[PDB]
Write an enzyme that holds these catalytic residues in place. Structure first.
Site, PDB file in Angstrom:
ATOM      1  N   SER A   1       0.807  -1.267   0.156  1.00 23.45           N
ATOM      2  CA  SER A   1      -0.094   0.010  -0.111  1.00 23.45           C
ATOM      3  C   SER A   1       0.841   1.311   0.181  1.00 23.45           C
ATOM      4  O   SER A   1       1.510   1.404  -1.026  1.00 23.45           O
ATOM      5  CB  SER A   1      -0.704   0.022   1.299  1.00 23.45           C
ATOM      6  OG  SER A   1      -2.016   0.961   1.050  1.00 23.45           O
TER       7      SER A   1
ATOM      8  N   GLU B   1      -9.489  -4.752  -4.903  1.00 20.64           N
ATOM      9  CA  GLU B   1      -8.692  -3.703  -4.151  1.00 20.64           C
ATOM     10  C   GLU B   1      -9.619  -2.804  -3.566  1.00 20.64           C
ATOM     11  O   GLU B   1      -9.644  -2.525  -2.130  1.00 20.64           O
ATOM     12  CB  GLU B   1      -7.821  -2.968  -4.992  1.00 20.64           C
ATOM     13  CG  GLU B   1      -6.634  -3.730  -5.618  1.00 20.64           C
ATOM     14  CD  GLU B   1      -5.363  -3.675  -4.692  1.00 20.64           C
ATOM     15  OE1 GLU B   1      -5.717  -2.822  -3.552  1.00 20.64           O
ATOM     16  OE2 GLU B   1      -4.658  -4.469  -4.704  1.00 20.64           O
TER      17      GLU B   1
ATOM     18  N   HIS C   1      -7.920  -5.381  -0.035  1.00 20.67           N
ATOM     19  CA  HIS C   1      -6.700  -4.779  -0.003  1.00 20.67           C
ATOM     20  C   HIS C   1      -5.994  -5.115   1.394  1.00 20.67           C
ATOM     21  O   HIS C   1      -6.640  -5.107   2.374  1.00 20.67           O
ATOM     22  CB  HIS C   1      -6.755  -3.232  -0.093  1.00 20.67           C
ATOM     23  CG  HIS C   1      -5.806  -2.403  -0.023  1.00 20.67           C
ATOM     24  ND1 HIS C   1      -4.933  -2.387  -1.218  1.00 20.67           N
ATOM     25  CD2 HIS C   1      -5.211  -1.536   0.961  1.00 20.67           C
ATOM     26  CE1 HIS C   1      -3.863  -1.467  -1.043  1.00 20.67           C
ATOM     27  NE2 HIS C   1      -3.890  -1.015   0.226  1.00 20.67           N
TER      28      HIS C   1
HETATM   29  P1  4OJ Z   1      -2.630   1.650   2.136  1.00 21.53           P
HETATM   30  O1  4OJ Z   1      -1.592   2.364   2.851  1.00 21.53           O
HETATM   31  O2  4OJ Z   1      -4.025   2.238   1.907  1.00 21.53           O
HETATM   32  O3  4OJ Z   1      -2.736   0.224   3.097  1.00 21.53           O
HETATM   33  C1  4OJ Z   1      -3.792  -0.105   4.252  1.00 21.53           C
HETATM   34  C2  4OJ Z   1      -4.334   1.124   4.730  1.00 21.53           C
HETATM   35  C3  4OJ Z   1      -5.191   0.929   5.869  1.00 21.53           C
HETATM   36  C4  4OJ Z   1      -5.192  -0.263   6.653  1.00 21.53           C
HETATM   37  C5  4OJ Z   1      -4.442  -1.323   6.113  1.00 21.53           C
HETATM   38  C6  4OJ Z   1      -3.587  -0.973   5.183  1.00 21.53           C
HETATM   39  C7  4OJ Z   1      -2.598  -2.245   4.691  1.00 21.53           C
END
Ligand code: 4OJ
Ligand code: NAG
Ligand code: NAG
Ligand code: NAG
Ligand code: 4OJ
Lengths: 542, 539
Positions: free
Chosen positions: B199, B330, B443
């Site tokens: 992420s 996602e 996700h």
């Molecule tokens: P990204 O940085 O959007 O990943 C996230 C965001 C919120 C919670 C869990 C995760 C893996």
């Protein structure tokens, strides 16, 4: 004696004698070249048709009349594909005559009537052409078939809107006049004024639609068949100002200001009326705005008169409960117009094209599209996994032209007529003729279901296959069924399985081909959502 | 115990011995890599840890960086799992090293982990980041660091000495230089370093790839469901300044609105309670949004010389190995965060108008026309009202926009510049998933498996799930050492082909064996990457 009472007919305007033709099945009665209007020549050029002044003696209806003055297509000389369409009788400014085919002997009960309006882009065509021969529908389906000539080209459509001298849509008026003529006289031939189905193809289908949308035409017919053309859509109408622009420009081109003048209308038309017909014909193509295909110079104008508003507006707001329409397209609509000036495309080779050629093509075929209107088109039509694929590119470009000028406007008219409460039946015609000339890549090109509708395969001397012959019969039965009952379906029978109405909800249409009917749901749905819904909002604020 | 004591140019360390299913591991937790950025050092680039005498306790996880704690679904394992498991403090900069027991044979390849969490949250302290299974099983030295998040990490008044921005990234980089100096003593190879992140983490990985001084600190990189490019991962210097100024303005600063020098504004900001910054953090966003978090990396003209777009477009990628990919659905996870009509409870069949407005939400920067375009694209026109489709399609809109198409764009751009790239799409939904099934493979749920968590018996994974886990660890570690996911010898796999701009081969990661598809998106990604931008201009 000596006079066959079957071929003698007295219509409102006088007496005519027709001729007995041999159709394959039986004989038929043909009455050809019945004048429905006083000839629009000299001072009558550009003007609405005056109705035929009555005649003494017996008029000779035994043979086809002159074809309205037109461009004769020189693209591929001595080639069946192009030349089937070309004028088969002599060109004249005095063309307004019609043809009536009926069974022999003339029908006992008042059979329903089919009026055929031809296509050819409002620059061309005639009822004399071999594919429109009414003999087979007459003989086999026992029907009564009418076809009229209408002024095409400048003579039909040149317009200086708001002038008494060149009011515009005089061609569409020719058509309507002949419609009235059918109302007044058709029963004399065994017809039934109470049942009249208009059916047409391409520009002709667009004409049909235009009569649906114009109130004076609505009182003359009960049912419509639009084959591969619509009144809405890019090619079939013009801005009053555009039409005016094109007119005064053509005027300039034929040396008719004269000398750098041209403010006064009546004066300008009256000069134009002096130039020999063929000069006007020679120049009608030079007035077009862009390098383009499937765009015609003189077409119906939106005058606030015949068309009270744009066909868009009209089909959007109308009330259609009176009405049943049968509308459809053929399998590849685009391919025909490609050889007409998108580069890379010939009939003489497989026509594989580069990407640059595809892009260029999209500019040509969607000529009023800005960049990003066109980049939208390219994004939509490209296979992005294989963006350079020459076969895919070719097939794409074909589909682009086809979808933009025919399929998506047919879908839009269907959807709206349905939503406005009309019985609509829809078809995609998928069968390629065995007799077909044009190469393989062009598929089932625009206009090639016509000969199967008129039942030309029922003629043995024409080299169709027996499967095509049966097929052709089946189509004839569909069409004359729609004509008679407002439904294409075989009434007694329940089978194959029957053909369901196109509705806004379900959107069912059927496939017309060698196999029996299958029902397909939704007609180029996502693509037509693009063309009909999105793309307008785009180039519109570009 | 011999191994549990290690040197580290900052001075003495005492690890702890831990049990993996298949062996022991030397775990060293909470090694300080920087002097705590508290007080006057808040908002500022990290200075390195000043050395110490004494045997320091590496035996447990340190503090979590000050952050918003997710209050949405109390006691629900799914949201709860990403919350901090340690205590919040502004003194958070500590990394974690995993070696197997015993220490190495030769220097082994090293895996550095950068956590996700949207720049508004995260920690290496987390459960799913349990570092030991990879170490013991695949013989890997595995580092995971905490970097600053939220205002503390990314609030910038670009051009200012005292709030330069991207300092959270600098925490990452410094953790990397500490690993370049000190990992050797753990039997890790300073010349094999593979950064992997998920992420926001992924975005940080690509962020280092694009940043010049970061280049010499690593070798290979894995980007899981995130990219340095795209809608959500960076802001302009302008918008950075705008948001910093507004957040200051929401708490006292500068006092009563005297305006003027950034120095006093940052000076004032420094004196507010950390929790205050966190409280007002969520207010500075321009529109109502789904992805799109307040404080993120900023294109300053320093850490990033130009926007990530420009950098992955002109960048020379000659020796680079990248393993990038996405999970199956996602967008789903995000929809419950405020697209109306989406809950974890009801199965979230929605109206058409719901979808229409949801589009406005998840693509907030879209004009009316761009919106009309997104709707036209994702609507099934044969059945425009079907709630199941509208739902799944809204999940697809948010997903394609914020992750998938970005991922694909980075993939192709890196390939076009002469990088070796391996693409993957993760199809498998864990049985341990507490989220409803309509969210598919949400996700961030491929992390459980990469980290070898099913190898833990007491966790209740299926057996084919742990053989899957072993598969994935083999994949990632093979890439770490080689710069290639495959077995040196074994065939099988079937071979995982390099993604190229022509073939566009990517692989499916499933319980059922390796599959190769082509054209990740393409149509639908040409929309987002090529066309929609042209349409965002002129509208
Ligand atoms: P990204 O940085 O959007 O990943 C996230 C965001 C919120 C919670 C869990 C995760 C893996
Ligand atoms: C238009 O002008 C011409 C002279 O060119 C004149 O003969 C005619 O009567 C005029 N008619 C109008 C419309 O005023
Ligand atoms: C801003 O104000 C402070 C007062 O403490 C000062 O130190 C600083 O140099 C001033 N000047 C600017 C414009 O930075
Ligand atoms: C589904 O549940 C959520 C939260 O309880 C709510 O927002 C949504 O309106 C619900 N759907 C409907 C319309 O029943
Ligand atoms: P449309 O009017 O375009 O139909 C045409 C045009 C040219 C030639 C034949 C046909 C049927």
């Amino acid at each position: 004696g000596r006079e066959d009472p079957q071929l003698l007919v007295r219509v409102r305007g006088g007496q005519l004698r027709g001729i007995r033709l041999k159709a394959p099945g039986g004989p038929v009665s043909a009455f050809l070249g019945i004048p429905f209007a006083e000839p629009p020549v000299g001072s009558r050029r550009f003007m609405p048709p005056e109705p035929k002044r009555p005649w003494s003696g017996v008029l000779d209806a035994t043979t086809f009349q002159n074809v309205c003055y037109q461009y004769v297509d020189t693209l591929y000389p001595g080639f069946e594909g192009t030349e089937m369409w070309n004028p088969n009788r002599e060109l004249s400014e005095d063309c307004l005559y019609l043809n009536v085919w009926t069974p022999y002997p003339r029908p006992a009960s008042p059979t329903p009537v089919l009026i055929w309006i031809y296509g050819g882009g409002f620059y061309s065509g005639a009822a004399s052409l071999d594919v429109y021969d009414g003999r087979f529908l007459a003989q086999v389906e026992g029907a009564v078939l009418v076809s009229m000539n209408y002024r095409v080209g400048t003579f039909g459509f040149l317009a200086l809107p708001g002038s008494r001298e060149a009011p515009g849509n005089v061609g569409l008026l020719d058509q309507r006049l002949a419609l009235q003529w059918v109302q007044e006289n058709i029963a004399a031939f065994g017809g039934d004024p109470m049942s009249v189905t208009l059916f047409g193809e391409s520009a002709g289908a667009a004409s049909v639609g235009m009569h649906i949308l114009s109130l004076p035409s609505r009182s003359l017919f009960h049912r419509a068949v639009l084959q591969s053309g619509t009144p809405n859509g890019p090619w079939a109408t013009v801005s009053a100002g555009e039409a005016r622009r094109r007119a005064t420009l053509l005027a300039r081109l034929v040396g008719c200001p004269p000398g750098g003048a041209g403010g006064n209308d009546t004066e300008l038309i009256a000069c134009l009326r002096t130039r020999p017909a063929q000069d006007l014909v020679d120049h009608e193509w030079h007035v077009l705005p862009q390098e383009s295909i499937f765009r015609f110079s003189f077409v119906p104008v939106v005058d606030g008169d015949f068309l009270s508003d744009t066909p868009e507006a009209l089909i959007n707001t109308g009330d259609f409960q009176d009405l049943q329409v049968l509308v459809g397209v053929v399998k590849d609509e685009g391919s025909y117009f490609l050889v007409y000036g998108v580069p890379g495309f010939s009939k003489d080779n497989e026509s594989l094209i580069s990407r640059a050629q595809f892009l260029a093509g999209v500019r040509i075929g969607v000529p009023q599209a800005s960049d990003l209107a066109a980049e939208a088109v390219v994004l939509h039509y490209t296979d992005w996994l294989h963006p350079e694929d020459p076969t895919h590119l070719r097939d794409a470009m074909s589909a682009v032209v086809g979808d933009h000028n025919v399929v998506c406007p047919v879908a839009q008219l269907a959807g709206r007529l349905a939503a406005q409460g009309a019985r609509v039946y829809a078809y995609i015609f998928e069968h390629r003729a065995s007799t077909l000339t044009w190469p393989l890549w062009m598929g089932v090109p625009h206009g090639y279901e016509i000969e199967f509708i008129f039942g030309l395969p029922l003629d043995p001397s024409l080299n169709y296959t027996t499967e095509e012959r049966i097929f052709a019969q089946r189509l004839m039965k569909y069409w004359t069924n729609f004509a008679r009952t407002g439904d294409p379906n075989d009434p007694r029978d329940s089978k194959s399985p029957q053909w369901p109405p196109y509705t806004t909800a379900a959107q069912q249409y059927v496939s017309l081909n060698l196999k029996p009917l299958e029902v397909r749901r939704g007609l180029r749905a996502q693509t037509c959502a693009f063309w009909n819904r999105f793309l307008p909002k785009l180039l519109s604020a570009t």
